[PDB]
Amino acid sequence: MVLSEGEWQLVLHVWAKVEADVAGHGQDILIRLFKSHPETLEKFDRFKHLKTEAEMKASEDLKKHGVTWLTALGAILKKKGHHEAELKPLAQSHATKHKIPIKYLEFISEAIIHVLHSRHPGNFGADAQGAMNKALELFRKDIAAKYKELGYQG
Ligand code: HEM
């Protein structure tokens, strides 16, 4: 699949707002994921112990990882589809080291959409949400292809 320049513009416009507070968005999204799909938390031996949302919000380590993963996604989105280089190491670690199923990538995609819709309604109308979904679908499609080449079901 291929996004038009207009669709990329909608994605990068709302992303520019996200970048005003990388740590906040990074954390909010992970917490949303963990609350909606508790099984995903079990994949993080580093955060598995956290029992409540309050404990998650107070975790300095969770906030730091929020910055790490969200910045990596931003780097990929800014490539506007030319992300082969960025995808390689990410696919290898998540398939071979962390063992993250494609299903969980769909779960975090839903969490991203939920948080952007809550925090940026003015810049995340139907057309903008559609473009972001398309961008995340492209990412998941390419990641799935890499998983297969690397020997992981997904
Ligand atoms: C938008 C998709 C995602 C991006 C861009 C992303 C990015 C990253 C990055 C950059 C790292 C650190 C370097 C590395 O190990 O590769 C990381 C680590 C990790 N990711 Fe992801 N990730 C994504 C989705 C997920 C999902 C959905 C899960 C699990 C539900 C997951 C679980 C992990 C785990 C367990 C680590 C190790 C954390 C630690 O112990 O330090 N990731 N991810």
Side-chain angles (χ1 to χ4, degrees):
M1 52 192 276
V2 177
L3 278 76
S4 63
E5 174 63 21
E7 286 168 332
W8 280 121
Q9 286 299 81
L10 292 175
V11 171
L12 299 175
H13 179 69
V14 69
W15 200 257
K17 307 306 178 187
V18 171
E19 284 184 338
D21 179 19
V22 173
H25 290 264
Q27 182 166 54
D28 281 359
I29 292 169
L30 286 176
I31 291 176
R32 174 60 184 184
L33 172 66
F34 298 152
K35 292 193 302 182
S36 297
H37 304 93
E39 61 271 30
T40 58
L41 179 58
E42 291 185 297
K43 287 291 181 176
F44 293 86
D45 296 307
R46 176 176 161 189
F47 308 121
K48 286 191 304 182
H49 65 296
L50 301 177
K51 300 178 184 293
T52 63
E53 177 173 358
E55 287 187 352
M56 291 176 197
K57 288 180 184 297
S59 178
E60 193 68 7
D61 274 300
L62 183 59
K63 183 174 191 174
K64 292 184 176 181
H65 184 64
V67 170
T68 297
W69 86 270
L70 195 63
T71 293
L73 175 60
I76 287 168
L77 293 178
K78 293 175 184 180
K79 297 306 297 299
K80 298 163 67 172
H82 303 281
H83 53 220
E84 185 188 302
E86 291 66 37
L87 263 59
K88 287 182 176 179
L90 181 67
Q92 181 172 51
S93 70
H94 286 56
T96 315
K97 185 59 178 61
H98 317 309
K99 283 78 171 185
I100 309 302
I102 293 298
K103 185 67 174 179
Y104 290 6
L105 296 178
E106 301 183 314
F107 290 167
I108 200 165
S109 293
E110 172 186 357
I112 291 171
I113 289 173
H114 175 90
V115 171
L116 295 186
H117 177 264
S118 302
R119 296 180 64 157
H120 307 285
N123 290 306
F124 208 63
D127 289 339
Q129 185 174 320
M132 181 61 80
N133 175 60
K134 195 171 178 178
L136 293 176
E137 286 192 356
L138 175 64
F139 164 76
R140 296 200 304 279
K141 179 184 179 181
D142 286 355
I143 267 282
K146 275 298 171 180
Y147 268 13
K148 180 179 173 296
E149 299 180 3
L150 297 170
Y152 180 57
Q153 308 181 63

